[PDB]
Amino acid sequence: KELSFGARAELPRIHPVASKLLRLMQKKETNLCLSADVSLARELLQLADALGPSICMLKTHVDILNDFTLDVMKELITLAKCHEFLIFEDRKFADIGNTVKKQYEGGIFKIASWADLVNAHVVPGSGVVKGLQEVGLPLHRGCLLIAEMSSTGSLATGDYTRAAVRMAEEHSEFVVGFISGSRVSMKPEFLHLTPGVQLEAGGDNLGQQYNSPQEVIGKRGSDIIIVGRGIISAADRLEAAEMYRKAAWEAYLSRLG
Amino acid sequence: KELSFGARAELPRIHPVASKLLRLMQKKETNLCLSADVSLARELLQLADALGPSICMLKTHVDILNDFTLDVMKELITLAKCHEFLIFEDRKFADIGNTVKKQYEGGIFKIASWADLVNAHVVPGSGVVKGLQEVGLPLHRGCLLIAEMSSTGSLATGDYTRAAVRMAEEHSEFVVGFISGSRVSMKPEFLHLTPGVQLEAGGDNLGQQYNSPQEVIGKRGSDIIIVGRGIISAADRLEAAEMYRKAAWEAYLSRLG
Ligand SMILES: N#Cc1cn([C@@H]2O[C@H](COP(=O)(O)O)[C@@H](O)[C@H]2O)c(=O)[nH]c1=O
């Protein structure tokens, strides 16, 4: 039998970060992750504040911010704490452990100092996880492994996907779930987050593909939708975020029974 | 009968950036790329200056620099021009075209403004290249596709590797070669750059594997060695760079006949 988000938050093997996320999802009735792909700090913060109540998570690409400072991330954390959402930096770590460890802790972004969650490609082998966890475990953080991608021509299929699942299952002290297009693990202690979501069928001119919240949450068994342009390009971003939230939440309720 | 670097710099289908590189390799007698994995701008610049004459390329991870500014990059360009080497930002773009185009142009780093070369993972499908090339074409930049990786457990093998090669062939206007462990393309217009290189075989504690310049260039047919710790860990980095340069250059001559 499928467990609710609230119950999954209490599973014996749950990671504290996944448990925190699952409890706010249940509390707020939201399984929407806003993708805030914006070029200005003030836009990031404005959106986080206005849409915070509607979202379980805010996904950042800090490298696209023309005016990133750690004082912007400090302010973001205050918003995350106030509205109750996790911060997920979509950094896509994708190299040897020695390197990604430095990229996660160091440099100007100091990602581990503010990001509840990060993600990593599995193509380098498990060293990518072992390096990240050297930094993330002391900082009480979690990681998502990229098991499938939303884009046309994606190579993250078949045996590659199976490899991501195995790596996750063997690094549960740090890995809390997946970026995927569908449920890829049978263990309920893992989260599935799915980008490439819009209400209407389509894609963009550079390989993005879209499926609806009901397809991805209801039919494919994923837990959370990640939505950028579907919301950000809308005239009314508050109504758009509420529409995606209600769509994802109802799809989850249906699948739950 | 294999072509010299100087000869390849004249091939019909050769990219302008590959041509410039191959000519300076030939001129300077170096097929060494320094991986300057350091956290201080002052160290990066002192290395670029001292080692410039020994290297054909300097590989950066700007996100590890604690004191990155665009002015640091200005200086690095001045040294690249003065000593004649290319700047390769090892950014590992690895997402949908819409996102990578912004990561390449924008944000704090403005990578396209100073990097002659960048690399991309092929896992997202050809959209990753299509996005990057939209930014890099007017700027006369080039891209390397990651066909193989140096690390234990790497999933960049078999059909994954073949996909990277096909993608590179199909985007030869922008893609100038590969990050690989071995020659993966027969087309001499393509460069092969190989990390995971030290004089002493072995590895690190986080999945990195090392093979000799002789093995990599001489036996495996790659063009350029990418060397980080083997040089940067030495007390005298210039002596170390010369040791690697001679080893790689001679292994290349050996292969020629
Ligand atoms: N990993 C991963 C992925 C990340 N993303 C990211 O999710 C966001 C999708 O945004 P949008 O297409 O505007 O809804 C965007 O930031 C993109 O970089 C995917 O779209 N697909 C993936 O497979």
Ligand SMILES: N#Cc1cn([C@@H]2O[C@H](COP(=O)(O)O)[C@@H](O)[C@H]2O)c(=O)[nH]c1=O
């Ligand atoms: N793509 C790629 C790769 C990049 N690298 C990069 O090359 C460098 C190797 O450094 P070192 O092991 O210190 O010689 C380091 O910056 C690492 O991130 C690999 O080692 N292997 C790869 O497959």
